[PDB]
Amino acid sequence: SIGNIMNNKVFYQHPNLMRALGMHETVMEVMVNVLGGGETKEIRFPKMVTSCCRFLCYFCRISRQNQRSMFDHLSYLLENSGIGLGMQGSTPLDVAA
Amino acid sequence: SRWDRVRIFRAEKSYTVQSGRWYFEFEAVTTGEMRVGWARPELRPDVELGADELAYVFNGHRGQRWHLGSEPFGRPWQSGDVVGCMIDLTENTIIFTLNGEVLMSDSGSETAFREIEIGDGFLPVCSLGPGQVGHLNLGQDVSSLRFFAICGLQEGFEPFAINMQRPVTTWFSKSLPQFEPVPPEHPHYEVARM
Amino acid sequence: HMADQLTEEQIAEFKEAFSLFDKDGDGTITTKELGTVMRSLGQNPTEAELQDMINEVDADGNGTIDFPEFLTMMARKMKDTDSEEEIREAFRVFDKDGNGYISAAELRHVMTNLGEKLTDEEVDEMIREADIDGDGQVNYEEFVQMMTA
Amino acid sequence: QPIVSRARPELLHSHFIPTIGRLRKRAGKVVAEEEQLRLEAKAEAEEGELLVRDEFSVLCRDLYALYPLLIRYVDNNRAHWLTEPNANAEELFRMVGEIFIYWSKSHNFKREEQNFVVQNEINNMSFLTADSKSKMARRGDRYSVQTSLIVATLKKMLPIGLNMCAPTDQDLIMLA
Numbered sequence: 001s002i003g004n005i006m007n008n009k010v011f012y013q014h015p016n017l018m019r020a021l022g023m024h025e026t027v028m029e030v031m032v033n034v035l036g037g038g039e040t041k042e043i044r045f046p047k048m049v050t051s052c053c054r055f056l057c058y059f060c061r062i063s064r065q066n067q068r069s070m071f072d073h074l075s076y077l078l079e080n081s082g083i084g085l086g087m088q089g090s091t092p093l094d095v096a097a
Numbered sequence: 098s099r100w101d102r103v104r105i106f107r108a109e110k111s112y113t114v115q116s117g118r119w120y121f122e123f124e125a126v127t128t129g130e131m132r133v134g135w136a137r138p139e140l141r142p143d144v145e146l147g148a149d150e151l152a153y154v155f156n157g158h159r160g161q162r163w164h165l166g167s168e169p170f171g172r173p174w175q176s177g178d179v180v181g182c183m184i185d186l187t188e189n190t191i192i193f194t195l196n197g198e199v200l201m202s203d204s205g206s207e208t209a210f211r212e213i214e215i216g217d218g219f220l221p222v223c224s225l226g227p228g229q230v231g232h233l234n235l236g237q238d239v240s241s242l243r244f245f246a247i248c249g250l251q252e253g254f255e256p257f258a259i260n261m262q263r264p265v266t267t268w269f270s271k272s273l274p275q276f277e278p279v280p281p282e283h284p285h286y287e288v289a290r291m
Numbered sequence: 292h293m294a295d296q297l298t299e300e301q302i303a304e305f306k307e308a309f310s311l312f313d314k315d316g317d318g319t320i321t322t323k324e325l326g327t328v329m330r331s332l333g334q335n336p337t338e339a340e341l342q343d344m345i346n347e348v349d350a351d352g353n354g355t356i357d358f359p360e361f362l363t364m365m366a367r368k369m370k371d372t373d374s375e376e377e378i379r380e381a382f383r384v385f386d387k388d389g390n391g392y393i394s395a396a397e398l399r400h401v402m403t404n405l406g407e408k409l410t411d412e413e414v415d416e417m418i419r420e421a422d423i424d425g426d427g428q429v430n431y432e433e434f435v436q437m438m439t440a
Numbered sequence: 441q442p443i444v445s446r447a448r449p450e451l452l453h454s455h456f457i458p459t460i461g462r463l464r465k466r467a468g469k470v471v472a473e474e475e476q477l478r479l480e481a482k483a484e485a486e487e488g489e490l491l492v493r494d495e496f497s498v499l500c501r502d503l504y505a506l507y508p509l510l511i512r513y514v515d516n517n518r519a520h521w522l523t524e525p526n527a528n529a530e531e532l533f534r535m536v537g538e539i540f541i542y543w544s545k546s547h548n549f550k551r552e553e554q555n556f557v558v559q560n561e562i563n564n565m566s567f568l569t570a571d572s573k574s575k576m577a578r579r580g581d582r583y584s585v586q587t588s589l590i591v592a593t594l595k596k597m598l599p600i601g602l603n604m605c606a607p608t609d610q611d612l613i614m615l616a
């Protein structure tokens with residue numbers, strides 16, 4: 001689903017529409033639920049986590065308004081970035097950066 | 098020899114001027130290698146005038162001005178020509194005139210040198226080459242000057258010795274070798290006391 | 292950002308170009324897909340350089356090129372075309388007519404459009420500062436070395 | 441310019457003084473019109489501002505047709521005038537001085553002179569260095585206020601004016 005969205009021209013032509021749909025909030029909530037479970041001993045479904053994180057990184061680079069929207073969850077991303085070191089690739093810390 | 102070629106004449110260091118506008122004349126009896134201008138009190142006797150930063154002189158043999166090198170300026174003089182050296186320490190400029198006509202460079206520059214720092218001050222100076230005769234007039238008698246009224250009087254310049262009883266004492270570079278202590282800062286020679 | 296660098300039309304054109312490379316439609320560009328279009332253009336590269344020209348833009352290192360990476364490549368290409376030529380457009384803003392000199396009337400025209408207003412006399416003050424030649428016009432060479440008018 | 445080097449002193453009174461006087465009164469007449477326009481501000485003042493610009497432009501042409509000859513003549517005769525005071529030389533100083541005052545006060549006068557030099561490619565440097573080249577001796581090459589003939593002629597005639605004043609008048613000059 002993330003790959004299809006990032007393959008769609010509308011996702012890049014209308015960043016405001018994506019922001020209105022709350023797409024970044026929905027992806028973030030899915031990611032933290034996986035990170036919330038097993039937050040210290042083991043992170044499972046690593047491919048999903050790095051797919052959501054990579055999606056959010058490209059989401060920020062589309063426009064400054066998208067980047068500002070993700071900036072409002074900077075503290076939310078940081079508190080989930082303590083165990084993100086275990087996963088390699090795109091991490092919640094990378095999204096915050 | 099290399100040293101018995103140029104004889105440098107300058108006023109005594111007690112006449113150093115650090116302010117005001119001053120004027121003096123130099124008559125070229127001959128037409129050979131002679132330089133005239135203004136020099137700092139620390140002028141070195143064995144160095145050609147204008148070859149370093151201690152003198153601002155005009156070479157009338159071929160029309161050059163000398164300060165840290167040579168560059169064309171003015172025209173060569175003839176026998177009997179009078180060079181009027183003028184320094185303006187309020188505008189930091191030096192003006193040379195030839196028979197009352199201000200000399201100019203290869204441009205509209207009416208001044209030979211500009212933005213000269215006062216520092217220690219300046220002294221009238223002249224150098225004569227082999228077989229050269231020149232007359233230096235520092236203006237103790239204002240009537241003796243031949244072109245001061247034509248160019249220099251109305252500009253606010255004064256003769257270098259306008260109000261002086263005795264003639265200005267002059268020092269010359271004597272080409273008699275003498276033994277002197279080796280300078281502690283000599284560029285090439287160092288003496289170590291063991 | 293992509294929105295700053297690219298317009299809606301450019302994004303549509305890039306997507307069509309990406310779909311031209313991706314004949315399968317899976318959303319990724321493989322080496323054979325990249326190699327096929329190169330042969331259509333005449334070049335016959337080897338897989339050694341073919342992989343290198345993929346890794347040079349492949350961000351996640353999966354070995355395939357997707358649309359987000361393809362757009363990021365084109366975004367850089369549009370951005371890096373202009374490096375220091377920004378002064379050329381600034382010169383043309385003051386230079387309405389199109390020649391190589393900035394006139395006082397032209398300087399009046401831009402100053403009229405801007406918020407600050409001049410009393411038709413101080414316009415000569417800054418133009419003579421910028422114009423060193425003294426011809427009353429500031430050329431491109433005088434503008435870049437020092438900008439006041 | 442080459443033939444002025446042999447000019448006789450009689451040309452100062454016979455030719456130069458009457459000619460500059462005509463230019464001086466023409467300059468005063470134009471600036472009188474210029475100040476008339478500004479005292480009554482109107483939307484019609486623009487229609488008439490161009491008229492004085494044309495009058496200044498033709499005036500600057502006449503000045504640049506005589507000053508280069510006058511400048512060379514002054515250089516070859518300034519020494520004699522300073523050595524022996526001359527009533528005619530002092531009169532010429534007043535004429536060139538008043539033209540300079542008109543040039544300094546009037547804004548259009550400076551503008552038209554600058555336009556005349558650049559559009560006609562007047563060197564304004566050979567006119568001041570020809571004597572140096574005759575004797576076999578960048579910044580504002582297009583135009584500069586320093587090399588303007590209106591102010592260059594005055595500076596060459598300035599010692600003549602200062603020669604009139606006695607040294608006791610220096611205090612009065614500062615007060616004025």
Ligand SMILES: [Ca+2]
Binds near residue numbers: 313317318319320321
């Ligand atoms: Ca494919």
Ligand SMILES: [Ca+2]
Binds near residue numbers: 350355356357
């Ligand atoms: Ca990829």
Ligand SMILES: [Ca+2]
Binds near residue numbers: 386389391392393
């Ligand atoms: Ca223009």
Ligand SMILES: [Ca+2]
Binds near residue numbers: 423424
């Ligand atoms: Ca210019």
